[PDB]
Design an enzyme around this catalytic site. Structure first.
Site, mmCIF file in Angstrom:
data_model
loop_
_atom_site.group_PDB
_atom_site.id
_atom_site.type_symbol
_atom_site.label_atom_id
_atom_site.label_comp_id
_atom_site.label_asym_id
_atom_site.label_seq_id
_atom_site.Cartn_x
_atom_site.Cartn_y
_atom_site.Cartn_z
ATOM 1 N N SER A 148 0.917 -1.101 0.043
ATOM 2 C CA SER A 148 0.145 -0.442 -0.220
ATOM 3 C C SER A 148 0.928 1.333 -0.108
ATOM 4 O O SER A 148 1.552 1.254 -1.262
ATOM 5 C CB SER A 148 -0.868 0.396 1.582
ATOM 6 O OG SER A 148 -1.783 1.282 1.223
ATOM 7 N N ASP A 242 -9.709 -3.509 -5.672
ATOM 8 C CA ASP A 242 -9.511 -2.507 -4.900
ATOM 9 C C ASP A 242 -8.778 -1.855 -5.702
ATOM 10 O O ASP A 242 -8.695 -1.385 -7.258
ATOM 11 C CB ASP A 242 -7.935 -3.291 -5.049
ATOM 12 C CG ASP A 242 -6.144 -2.227 -3.759
ATOM 13 O OD1 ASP A 242 -7.090 -0.656 -3.773
ATOM 14 O OD2 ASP A 242 -4.956 -2.923 -4.463
ATOM 15 N N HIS A 272 -7.371 -5.253 -1.613
ATOM 16 C CA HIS A 272 -7.149 -4.240 -0.721
ATOM 17 C C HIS A 272 -6.099 -4.437 0.133
ATOM 18 O O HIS A 272 -7.571 -4.681 1.284
ATOM 19 C CB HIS A 272 -6.569 -2.912 -0.692
ATOM 20 C CG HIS A 272 -6.026 -2.138 -0.158
ATOM 21 N ND1 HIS A 272 -4.619 -1.847 -1.743
ATOM 22 C CD2 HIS A 272 -5.135 -1.147 0.778
ATOM 23 C CE1 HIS A 272 -4.078 -0.613 -0.843
ATOM 24 N NE2 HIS A 272 -4.199 -0.468 0.618
#
Length: 298
Positions: A148, A242, A272
């Site tokens: 991320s 995501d 995600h």
């Protein structure tokens, strides 16, 4: 493709000050680790002197060392949340499954520190690890990794590496954020209800960036960089559902076309964050992907 069944169930069962939000993030990570305990692993805590201050690290030592480069891992959390403890479940497994030494980095969080402070810290820690590597019996070229926001940092560190005289053997990007300027179809279509939401992303940017113009800076949006030639070999793992999927996959395609050895793996039916959610077997599958990719570096 359909949502993974366990993901579907997880989303269905989802139900503040800054300090409270950070605590809530940490509590969520703890709950998942209680549901699926991490492997035991030897660790040592330390502190690296960076150009922006002391940065705490934790070095993970595998039971059996099989990989010849240190990994330097930068946790996710939107640049605002997370720490070494929130990502221990992932890092412990990377360490023991790859058989690698891993340096997990507690870089400075926003909004207390703003862009580009953590980028600088993350470079400094990578440089330290490259210097230490021979006294660990390792090659002085490092592998950078992150999920991320941490995948953003790994990507930027990788783009800056040559200019910073930093030897980097590979980059491992787990559902990274890479383009804060452009909307992609996935960003539009999976904007709400898949754990990582539009509103949160906006807020994270407001905390991290100094001004709205920072979105176009390549140290914030590495996908904007026009020259990707000669960058480190890349593993780019995305989740199907995501908002950040498409920018991740597009960056992998760009790397590939720039002659960078690239492996691009989409985990179908996933969301995600799945590589810090050990309730999903796909987390361990993705860690196996890392081990298989790293086998090919040497």
């Amino acid at each position: 493709m359909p949502l993974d069944p366990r993901v579907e169930q997880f989303l269905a069962q989802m139900p503040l000050s800054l300090a409270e939000a950070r605590q809530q993030f940490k509590q969520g990570a703890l709950l998942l680790d209680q549901m699926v305990p991490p492997p035991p692993v030897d660790t040592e805590d330390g502190t690296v002197v960076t150009t922006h201050g002391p940065v705490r690290i934790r070095r993970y030592i595998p039971d059996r060392l099989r990989f010849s480069h240190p990994l330097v891992f930068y946790h996710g959390g939107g640049f605002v949340f997370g720490d070494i403890d929130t990502h221990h479940g992932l890092v412990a497994r990377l360490c023991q499954t790859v058989g690698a030494t891993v340096i997990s980095v507690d870089y400075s969080l926003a909004p207390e520190a703003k862009f580009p402070v953590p980028v600088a810290e993350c470079i400094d820690v990578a440089r330290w690890a490259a210097h230490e590597a021979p006294g660990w019996g390792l090659k002085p070229s490092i592998v950078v990794a992150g999920d991320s926001a941490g995948g953003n940092l790994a990507a930027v560190v990788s783009q800056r590496a040559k200019d910073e005289s930093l030897p980097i053997a590979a980059q491992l990007l787990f559902y990274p954020a890479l383009d804060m300027v452009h909307e992609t179809p996935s960003k539009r279509d999976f904007a709400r209800g898949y754990l990582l939401e539009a509103d949160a992303m906006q807020w994270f940017g407001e905390q991290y960036l100094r001004t709205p113009d920072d979105v176009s800076h390549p140290w914030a949006s590495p996908a904007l960089s026009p020259d990707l030639t000669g960058l480190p070999p890349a593993l780019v793992i995305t989740a199907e559902y995501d908002p950040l999927r498409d920018e991740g996959e597009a960056y992998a395609e760009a790397l590939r076309a720039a002659g960078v050895p690239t492996e691009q793996i989409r985990f179908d039916g996933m969301i995600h964050g799945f590589m810090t959610m050990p309730i999903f077997p796909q987390m361990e599958a993705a860690i196996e992907a890392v081990a298989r990719f790293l086998e090919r570096i040497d």
